[PDB]
Amino acid sequence: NYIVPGEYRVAEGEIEINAGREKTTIRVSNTGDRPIQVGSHIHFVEVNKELLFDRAEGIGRRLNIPSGTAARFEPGEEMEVELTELGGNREVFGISDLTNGSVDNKELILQRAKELGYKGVE
Amino acid sequence: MHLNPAEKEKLQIFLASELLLRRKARGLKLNYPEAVAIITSFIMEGARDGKTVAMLMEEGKHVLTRDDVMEGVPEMIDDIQAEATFPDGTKLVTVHNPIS
Amino acid sequence: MHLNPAEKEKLQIFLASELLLRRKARGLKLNYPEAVAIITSFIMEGARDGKTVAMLMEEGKHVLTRDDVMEGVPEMIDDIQAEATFPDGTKLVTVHNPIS
Amino acid sequence: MHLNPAEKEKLQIFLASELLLRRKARGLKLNYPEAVAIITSFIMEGARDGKTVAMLMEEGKHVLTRDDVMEGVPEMIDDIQAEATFPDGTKLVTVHNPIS
Amino acid sequence: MKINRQQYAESYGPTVGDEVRLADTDLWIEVEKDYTTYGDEVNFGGGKVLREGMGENGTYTRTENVLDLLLTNALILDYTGIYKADIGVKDGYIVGIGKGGNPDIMDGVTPNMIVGTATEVIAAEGKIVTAGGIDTHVHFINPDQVDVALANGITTLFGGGTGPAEGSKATTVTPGPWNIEKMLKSTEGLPINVGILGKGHGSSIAPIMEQIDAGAAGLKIHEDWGATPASIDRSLTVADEADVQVAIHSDTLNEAGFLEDTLRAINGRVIHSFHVEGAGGGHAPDIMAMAGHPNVLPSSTNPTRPFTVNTIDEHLDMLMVCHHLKQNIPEDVAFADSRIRPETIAAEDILHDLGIISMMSTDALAMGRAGEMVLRTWQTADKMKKQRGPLAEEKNGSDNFRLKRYVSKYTINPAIAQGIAHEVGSIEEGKFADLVLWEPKFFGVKADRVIKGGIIAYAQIGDPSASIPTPQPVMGRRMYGTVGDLIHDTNITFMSKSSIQQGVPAKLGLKRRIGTVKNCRNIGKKDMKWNDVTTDIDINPETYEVKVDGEVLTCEPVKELPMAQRYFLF
Amino acid sequence: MKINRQQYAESYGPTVGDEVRLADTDLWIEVEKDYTTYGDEVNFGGGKVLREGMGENGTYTRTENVLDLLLTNALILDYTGIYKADIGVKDGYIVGIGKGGNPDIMDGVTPNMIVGTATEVIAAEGKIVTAGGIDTHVHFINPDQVDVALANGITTLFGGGTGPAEGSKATTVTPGPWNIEKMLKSTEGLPINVGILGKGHGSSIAPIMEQIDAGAAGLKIHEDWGATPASIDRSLTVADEADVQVAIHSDTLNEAGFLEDTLRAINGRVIHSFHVEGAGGGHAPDIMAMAGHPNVLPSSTNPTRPFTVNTIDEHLDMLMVCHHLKQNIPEDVAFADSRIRPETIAAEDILHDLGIISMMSTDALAMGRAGEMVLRTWQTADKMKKQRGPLAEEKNGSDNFRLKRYVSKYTINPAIAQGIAHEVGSIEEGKFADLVLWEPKFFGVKADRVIKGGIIAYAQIGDPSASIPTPQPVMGRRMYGTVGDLIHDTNITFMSKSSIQQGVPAKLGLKRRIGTVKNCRNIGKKDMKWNDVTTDIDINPETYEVKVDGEVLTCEPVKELPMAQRYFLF
Ligand SMILES: [F-]
Ligand SMILES: [F-]
Ligand SMILES: [F-]
Ligand SMILES: [F-]
Ligand code: NI
Ligand code: NI
Ligand code: NI
Ligand code: NI
């Protein structure tokens, strides 16, 4: 019966994020010499050019991590991450200007990525 | 004296600490604003004494203990932050979880 | 600390009482605002101590006597009123004719 | 209490002097605003005690000496001026070159 | 991937089924529902979600479903529910309650809650958000009272006065066209919403009505101006024509009538009965019986709230002091003993808990505390839980029913009573964005940030010279919503329809938002949210014992309250 | 008759060749030239020179070359020189720098500097007079920050915010047309010059541009809103059309790119790089390399200024606190160690001394101190003198070159960067009379009097009840320039050309002087007075060591600073 003012008494159970969406695991490496940290809601194909991964597997996806968190890649670090699907209209505008429309346009996205030197366009 | 706005405000912290210290001395368990005032004034006086930021981050956790304060007060105070003029100019001290 | 407007104002009463108490201690007969400050601060500290309103109504008449104050001061002070946070929340204490 | 604007302001000088006096007591060399506060409060309390303007002009030069203050502080303070209520009403005291 | 509930609540605030303690009370509120899509929570900061192309949309102009302001992850406590949502504000009004962000990439975004280039963000994760308090019993006596009110989450002041004049120190009255005009002009500088009451006294209609036409928003009948059958009648005839509310402080002395005579004069018309328990004024000893009637909108003032061990001693003397009574005048002593009654004060606690008294109010500076309406509401609810148990209506564990009953007393119900609930009084789409954020540890005690018309007006914030705003001293301070001409756009002056039609704002050069008082005369007790109970209240004229449904309503005074010495420096 | 130099300086302030110590620093400034005619010095008082028929002309009307205000015997410290002159003000602007008085009887009177019936006098003998500080990195979080700024001689605040909303607590952004309008209205009550930055984020032009048309004076790109290649690009396209400046806080996380990618997006366009050292934000670890580029206008924020023994401990924790980081999240720890770097902070001291970082700024209340931009500029210069010696450019004895280099950092250079140097930022004929008087003993620490548009706005002054204004307590106080409608004429709201052309001031009822932002897009590093150096800055990605011209730039932190414990009560 000690009172902590304003304390929570949370319910039992756990919260599943991004429920019902396809999940994909991919390996990613920071080929650069400075650290790269990637937020939960950036269109994954549009991350820093010097991250090497199968760029196609980043299209229409973002990290499957709690909203507002990030994945960190030290220089030279390679690790696996899990991605989830973008939702809503599944359109991306701005960021690196690789999409500017539907994420369904994989060929166009990859063409732009390749031309601009985003590593890992296969 | 050429008091600036912060010097005027911060006099009030010293005063509140003096009040709280009198309450503690007559045997009262201190409340939330009293505890904050005491620890804050301690930090500012410590800067004036020429202690380092790192010293004050450590010392600030030993100014008041849970038996000095009312139930729940330790858990109400996540940190106390204060800026003061050190020998090397104004710096911020943050004391994390000052009362266990 | 989360000071509200009244907490800031009422710090000044404590300060004025501390000033007045120093003047009394060096042998001065106290004047009108000094006497009011001392009795007011006594009430507020008494609330903080957990005394009742009724206790403070009684005690407030014995804080200063006519020999502690200048000529005419007892007759200038018809009553002193102060609000403070008691264990059961804010209450008003009125001390009637505090100095006979 | 019926505090007027000057009474409210001048409480802050007393407070700053009390702060400075605590710093001096724990062995610190005082700085510019600290030194000014101590001498100013001394003047105002002296008026309250019923000293004359002429007494305070003299005494104010002996409150702090150069060994009580930081390098350069004596030369920073050309004079200290304060008004207070004497037995014969408000008067201005100017202490010239208070710290040699 | 799953997150445990403790960690989820720490990051985003609580979600469905989680409970939160209100300050240091025994009251727990439970999240009833949550508008989020788990994994797509909005948040703002370095590497967070509300960034261009991500949770912030980079395409749409402000007009295109974009918000001016998003409060993320709020725990809303309101008569409408206790639930988790983002709150979206535009043009100073609440335009969406739901889920904000970017439909490009997020699921479940409310269509008009797009975070775009135009959008400011306030993080409400881990905060309780309520409507601004509506204080309908304000004496305008000392302008320093405004900050006092804001600091405890009040955003609308309805009442009267011209400063520390004896009429105003006694009564919520700004009398006559000229005093009303002057105080409407003064109001241009007060950083809070305001409505002004005229003097509800006269035996001819014109002297009363000209106050309404001058810009008053209502009337106050007060015994100190003669709460006679005639003044009651004329005021209500005016109010019925003008569509404004009348508040009453009845004839304590029973000089021209007893309670039944006042009720006869009212003649079934709608009226707001101030300090209905009666320590604050009214027919001795039985005024509180007003609260049983269907045409009465009953409020308490705060010094009797709740019943404590110091209440009587304090009031007996408070009454003596402010009425300049003498212990050596037997009439004055008998008067005080007839007016300050533990029997009715104790029953008042219970009548609140039963939903029979519908509203709280301050009585600021005229037997009431400007910054304690919200505070004492929750202290009352806590005392009632301790003494009467969880209400029968509660769904196991939580105090949600009680919390909705009590929040309604100082938000929606006073707004409905005054004819201003189209603008203020609850967190609902289409209403003015007067919002109060509270840390749960300080809930009901000291507001974190008070939003007025969509801009922060008051905040507990620290050293203005510091590197960040959190270092000491943290104190309540006026924010940019109160500065310059922004004070005009963030606050509402409520006025009668007739004064608005007659162009009073232009005549006086009022620049504040102008709110119309309406739909005051067609309401009753049944319209008081969660507090709609009508019943026959019997008050024994000899013993002052209060009975409802044949049961004596009594409870004990308490020696200690929560929301008290843990928090306050004095 | 001859006067010895000591006595001359005591009476009239110093003259040619005399030196003055800056506060308690080791820095000495030397009078380079003097506009007076010895024997005809202007002075005011009983039996003094500025009296009718004598030094005051009794013939001419105000229009006829007469001044509204003469500052007598000023020691000017400015990028244009360090020299002795009278300063003449008329219609709120500096109209003459030279020699004031009466051509009837005095030699050498500047023709438009007649002291006449219309002329007020401020005695500046023995004072140092500078331009008001131009702070271009202001978060509008707490209105109490304005006095803090004035007290340390700042007269223009450029930045953004809506109060203590999370967006504003992180970023200098007032987002969207509505928030911009609201803050323009708030600005009517702030006694300081102001310009407001919109959100430099979006992937379409219109959402960004509508902020400029609404009255923003510039844009801020901030990583917390997504400092992506797209947002950078669109903001600069808008700025190039609108002729306003863009400030950037780049992608610390290197999420969408490294420094080179941000530079590619900028594509040679002009940009103001905030807190270029990077503890305050930006591409880790090499952001400071921005300061080598010709199209970059680089500023520091003040908490790293200068490098001291407490700086790192303080920042590592400051960062942790304000970003709500956890010691038990390895990413957050690695993030802090990558962002707070002694190697780059030490190099930042040197880069200032070399003229490679051109500007200072506060970062008020969002990792920066509102009242310490001027203070820390001089503490930096003093540390550099102690550690690096007199600069090679100095003419024996004095620190004039260093003093002009450093005063430019907080006066003229930020004004040029923002497109407002036609109005403010230096003591020159034709510019607004924003002037700060300093006693040399308090120089850079506490301003004596701050003149805004030719009227004193803020002053260190004593007891308002006293016989004279010098008795205690002497404290900073708002003066008559801030009162009533005079606040409108003594301060400038800076706005975009398009908003001015579209009549925004009239639409919003703005009464302040309206300043036009212009000539922001056609400038570069070469235009930064005394701080125009371009070079290749190499930052080692492993060790964070900074090299220029193949030399490692390093220096030690100091344990003590001047302008510190001798002066401050806390
Ligand atoms: F009343
Ligand atoms: F009342
Ligand atoms: F920042
Ligand atoms: F920043
Ligand atoms: Ni009443
Ligand atoms: Ni009342
Ligand atoms: Ni920044
Ligand atoms: Ni910033």
Swiss-Prot record, chain A:
Q: How does it assemble?
A: Heterotrimer of UreA (gamma), UreB (beta) and UreC (alpha) subunits. Three heterotrimers associate to form the active enzyme.
E.C. number, please? 3.5.1.5
Q: Which reaction does it catalyse?
A: urea + 2 H2O + H(+) = hydrogencarbonate + 2 NH4(+)
Q: Does the keyword Cytoplasm apply?
A: yes
Q: What name does the UniProt record give this protein?
A: Urease subunit beta
- What organism, scientifically named, is this protein from? Sporosarcina pasteurii
Compartments, record wording:
Cytoplasm
In the record, the note on similarity to other proteins reads: Belongs to the urease beta subunit family.
Q: Does the record carry Hydrolase as a key word?
A: yes
What is its pathway?
A: Nitrogen metabolism; urea degradation; CO(2) and NH(3) from urea (urease route): step 1/1
Keywords on this record? Answer: Cytoplasm, Hydrolase
Source species, domain of life = Bacteria
Q: Which GO terms describe its biological process?
A: urea catabolic process
Q: Name one GO molecular function term.
A: urease activity
GO CC terms in record: urease complex
UniProtKB/Swiss-Prot annotation, chains B, C, D:
Where does it sit, as one GO cellular component term? cytoplasm
- Organism domain of life: Bacteria
- Which species is the source of this protein? Sporosarcina pasteurii
Catalyzed reactions per annotation: urea + 2 H2O + H(+) = hydrogencarbonate + 2 NH4(+)
E.C. number, please? 3.5.1.5
Checking NCBIfam families in the record gives: PRK13241.1, urease_gam
Complex formation: Heterotrimer of UreA (gamma), UreB (beta) and UreC (alpha) subunits. Three heterotrimers associate to form the active enzyme.
Its protein name is Urease subunit gamma
PTM field: Although not discussed in the published references, Met-1 is represented in the submitted PDB entries as being modified by either a formyl, a carboxyl, or an acetyl group. The N-terminal is probably N-(dihydroxymethyl)methionine, the hydrated form of N-formylmethionine.
| Pathway(s) this gene product operates in, as recorded in its UniProt entry | Nitrogen metabolism; urea degradation; CO(2) and NH(3) from urea (urease route): step 1/1
Name one matching Pfam family: Urease_gamma
The protein's matches in Gene3D superfamilies, at most eight in alphabetical order, are given as: Urease, gamma-like subunit
Curated annotation (Swiss-Prot), chains E, F:
According to the UniProt entry, its GO molecular function terms are: nickel cation binding; urease activity
Protein's name according to its UniProt entry: Urease subunit alpha
Please give the family membership noted in the entry: Belongs to the metallo-dependent hydrolases superfamily. Urease alpha subunit family.
According to its UniProt record, how is this protein modified after translation? Carboxylation allows a single lysine to coordinate two nickel ions.
Q: What is its main location?
A: cytoplasm
What activates or inhibits this protein? Inhibited by fluoride.
Q: Which UniProt keywords apply?
A: Cytoplasm, Hydrolase, Metal-binding, Nickel
Locate the residues binding Ni(2+) 2.
220, 249, 275
Question: Which pathway does the database say it acts in?
Answer: Nitrogen metabolism; urea degradation; CO(2) and NH(3) from urea (urease route): step 1/1
Binding-site list for Ni(2+) 1: 137, 139, 220, 363
One GO term (biological process): urea catabolic process
User: What are the subcellular locations of this protein?
Assistant: Cytoplasm
- NCBIfam families named in the record: PRK13207.1, urease_alph
